[PDB]
Design a protein around this nucleic acid. Structure first.
Ligand SMILES: [Zn+2]
Ligand SMILES: [Zn+2]
Lengths: 76, 91, 135, 95, 118, 191
RNA sequence: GCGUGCGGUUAACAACCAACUUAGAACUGGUACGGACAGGGGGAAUCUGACUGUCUAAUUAAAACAUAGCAUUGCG
RNA sequence: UCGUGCCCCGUGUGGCGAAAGGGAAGCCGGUUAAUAUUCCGGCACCUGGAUGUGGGUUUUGCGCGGCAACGCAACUGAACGCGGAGACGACGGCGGGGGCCCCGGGCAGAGUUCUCUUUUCUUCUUAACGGUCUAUCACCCUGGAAACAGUUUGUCUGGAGAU
């Protein structure tokens, strides 16, 4: 797993061809939001403060990329 | 503060092996555990590595020497008469 | 008598250019604020010209006679002075202390050093300077 | 004789003791004499001879070790090589 | 809380290839983790000192890292240390100079012998 | 034990001039009281170097240049034919015949004394450590000096364990049972 | 917040924090106080083998054997 | 191309022999009546191969920076050589790190409660793999030490350059 600290790098990673899926994790106790994109080798995580602009980053993400919110319980 | 009156380094052997044998082993142990002045770098750091092998801790030079002393009197006399013979041969 | 003067040939003993031959452009014995010790401004050879044989073609000779230079500020303790001297008119004040503060000035200085050194090498003189030291 | 001359130079003139300061004196060109002890490593001995050949400085090969050279300079430490910058009242340079 | 552990492999002997360390899992359980032997620093071929700037790895792990990480940007870098390289440079220069001096002296002696013979 | 302690094979360089080697290591040899010296020589016929293993004479050191051949100097560690040395020179690892790479005076503190030369038939009279006199061909080589490690047997072993450690790496029979302590079926001294 | 040029060694002072040993004293119960457990009897001598070590698995563990030390013989 | 040849090199010789020696690479969670570092989920790694994209280098053709120790994502390298790693005893005390043990506070649960006990006990965890900032030895630069200094529990180190 790798942490991406730059929005431009994260957008390029999400525009890569092997980007199979992406998910959004919300941690309200720490007031943070994580964008995780699954590629062939690595899972890339961008960590942001929970904010409206962080919500609008989803619209700048590519539309063909499937994006899902993480539920509160990981059911098997 | 002298702790023993005569046995010295031979006190580790206690009352065993005989007084004369402890006295005989003492001289070799003292010479083989002493530190010697290096003839290359001048520091007092030459110690025995194995039997006949003397190494300097500072300049890392290793020298072939005597079994329990760095130099042997027969070897020193050999060097002297060798230098005499070399002078006679060259001149 | 002092020997660390201009046109003195020295060997670099430490750093990325250790073993290379340099010619002293400017001696600074008293030191500066940035380098508070005796040092020198030198120009030298990073890549020596290759050997030339009698059956080589002219294009191959021209390709193998190229020289890659470098310029350097170097401490006196990292130099080994040699009795050789290399007097070049084109290298007079090719570098100064302010040359090393700007990347483009280093480029222009290295181009000038390359031109002058290749001229001297093609002349056939000072062959010891252009042969590499083997160690 | 060299020991008495060294003692007189220590008393009156100016010296530097040691390899790095001797090299600095040879680079400055104000070195008048270089003394090199017998047990100095041959590479350092050749380097000191080359520096003295460049600076036109005389070299005396001291027959004692670095211990003996330090004692002759009047110190309680060893000295492999030393440089005389001012002879003082001695005549060590005239030889 | 159960604090005692077991080997996770079929070797039950405390050999040099059977090194373990204790971890606590995200499941809250104490467990062993089999670990490899420590890497060894490369050493200078002249003096034997540990070469600074070079990682200490098991031998085949060096095939997985890039060239600048395995070496020092200097002649003999990653094989000989800086002091030994400086000694090599000074020794080579001085010995070649002495060879030229001896050749000059030999030529002068040969010329003197030829003049004496003639 | 890695390599046997032998001279170089007798070649053109040692027969007609000298060759220089450098002493790189002085090492302990298990089962042998004398230290060994690893000396690196050049091969005259190829680029690769040759490593040799000599018995180290006293005074040899790492970084020392030694010289082997007919014209080598009379200095400790140098290997010369006996015809090139004066009378009274002590040597070690003396060849019985030229090219056998050394046979005589090999243990610690021991040496062979060159007593005389007979140049007419090319022979050399030598004295061995046992006091015996011998005649060898004058082209037999020997290393100038005395084998290092002398005085080893002056120290008492003092302990059965030290004797055991000495003989376990040597393969010699230890402990030793007396014949008279045996039954008559085992030893003629038995009973 | 760093740079100097100074000036002073009563910080011998304050604030906060922390653990286990050692010594001394009063009081007090007593048939017992290393309260169970754990844990040398000591001494005078003689013979004997120097010592540590080893053997007769399944009747003998020893003054037997070995040992270091000493002596002799053979071998270039 | 006298087309049906010529040149270079030297070291020998094959195999078996270790589920405790050497050795490329996997962790966590869950799952069965019975297997699990093997299944399932998530997250990785090694070895080998092919061939692209980005980035790098180059018109001073094979990078640049630092006095230096050396650094940085790259940054040509056949034959023939040199070196390192693999690769190494036993014992003693000292220092660092993980885990365990121990103490205090807090939320939740449980037990005790004639009296006492703000009480006694239990859960409070974080893997491989990576990024980043640091960690004894050692090494480099300045400078030149007797009124010798630094310094370990253990007396070693320094004009061969200490503090
Ligand atoms: Zn030394
Ligand atoms: Zn080195």
């Amino acid at each position: 797993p790798q942490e991406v600290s730059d929005i431009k790098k994260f957008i390029e990673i999400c525009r890569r061809k092997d980007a199979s899926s992406a998910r959004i994790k919300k941690n309200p106790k720490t007031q943070q939001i994580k964008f995780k994109v699954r590629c062939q080798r690595f899972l890339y995580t961008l960590v942001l403060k929970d904010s409206d602009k962080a919500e609008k980053l989803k619209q700048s993400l590519p539309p063909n990329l499937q994006i899902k919110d993480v539920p509160k319980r990981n059911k098997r | 503060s002298k702790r023993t009156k005569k046995v010295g380094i031979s006190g580790k052997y206690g009352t065993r092996y005989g007084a004369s044998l402890r006295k005989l082993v003492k001289k070799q142990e003292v010479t083989q555990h002493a530190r010697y002045t290096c003839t290359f770098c001048g520091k007092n750091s030459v110690r025995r590595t194995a039997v006949g092998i003397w190494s300097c801790k500072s300049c890392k030079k290793t020298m072939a020497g005597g079994a329990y002393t760095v130099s042997t009197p027969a070897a020193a006399a050999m060097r002297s008469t060798l230098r005499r013979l070399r002078e006679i041969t060259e001149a | 008598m002092k020997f660390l003067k201009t046109s003195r040939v020295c060997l670099v003993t430490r750093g990325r250019y250790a073993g290379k031959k340099v010619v002293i452009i400017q001696p600074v014995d008293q030191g500066t604020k940035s380098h508070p010790y005796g040092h020198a401004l030198v120009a030298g050879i990073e890549r020596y010209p290759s050997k030339i044989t009698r059956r080589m073609s002219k294009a191959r000779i021209e390709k193998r006679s190229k020289i890659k230079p470098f310029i350097k500020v170097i401490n006196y303790n990292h130099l080994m002075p040699t009795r050789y001297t290399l007097e070049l008119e084109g290298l007079k004040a090719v570098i100064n202390a302010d040359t090393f503060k700007e990347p483009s000035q280093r480029e222009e200085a290295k181009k000038t050093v390359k031109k002058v050194l290749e001229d001297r090498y093609n002349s056939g003189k000072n062959r010891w300077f252009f042969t590499p030291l083997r160690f | 004789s060299i020991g008495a001359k060294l003692a007189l130079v220590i008393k009156s003139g100016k010296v530097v003791l040691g390899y790095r300061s001797t090299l600095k004196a040879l680079r400055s060109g104000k070195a008048k004499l270089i003394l090199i002890a017998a047990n100095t490593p041959p590479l350092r001995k050749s380097e000191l001879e080359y520096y003295s050949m460049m600076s036109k400085t005389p070299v005396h090969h001291y027959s004692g070790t670095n211990i003996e050279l330090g004692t002759a300079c009047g110190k309680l430490f060893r000295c492999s090589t030393m440089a005389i910058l001012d002879a003082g009242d001695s005549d060590i340079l005239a030889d | 809380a159960p604090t005692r552990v077991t080997y996770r492999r079929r070797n039950p002997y405390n050999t040099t290839s059977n090194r373990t360390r204790v971890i606590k899992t995200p499941g809250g359980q104490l467990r062993v983790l089999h670990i490899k032997k420590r890497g060894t620093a490369p050493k200078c071929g002249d003096c034997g000192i540990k070469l600074p700037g070079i990682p200490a790895l098991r031998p085949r792990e060096y095939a997985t890292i890039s060239k600048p990480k395995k070496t020092v940007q200097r002649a003999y870098g990653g094989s000989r240390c800086g002091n030994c390289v400086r000694d090599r440079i000074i020794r080579a220069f001085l010995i070649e100079e002495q060879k030229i001096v001896k050749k000059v002296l030999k030529e002068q002696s040969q010329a003197e012998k030829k003049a004496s013979k003639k | 034990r890695k390599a046997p302690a032998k001279f170089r094979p007798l070649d053109y360089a040692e027969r007609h001039g000298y060759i220089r080697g450098i002493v790189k290591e002085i090492i302990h040899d298990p089962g042998r009281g004398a230290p060994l010296a690893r000396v690196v020589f050049r091969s005259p016929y190829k680029y690769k170097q040759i490593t040799e293993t000599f018995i180290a004479n006293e005074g040899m050191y790492t970084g020392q240049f030694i010289y082997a051949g007919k014209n080598a100097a009379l200095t400790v560690g140098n290997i010369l034919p006996l015809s090139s040395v004066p009378e009274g020179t002590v040597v070690s690892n003396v060849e019985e015949k030229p090219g056998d790479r050394g046979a005589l005076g090999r243990t610690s503190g021991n040496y062979v004394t060159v007593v005389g030369h007979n140049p007419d038939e090319g022979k050399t009279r030598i004295k061995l450590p046992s006091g015996a006199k011998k005649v060898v061909p004058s082209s037999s080589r020997g290393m100038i000096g005395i084998v290092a490690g002398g005085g080893r047997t002056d120290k008492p072993l003092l302990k059965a364990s030290r004797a055991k450690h000495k003989f376990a790496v040597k393969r010699n029979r230890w402990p030793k049972t007396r014949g008279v302590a045996m039954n008559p079926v085992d030893h003629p001294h038995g009973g």
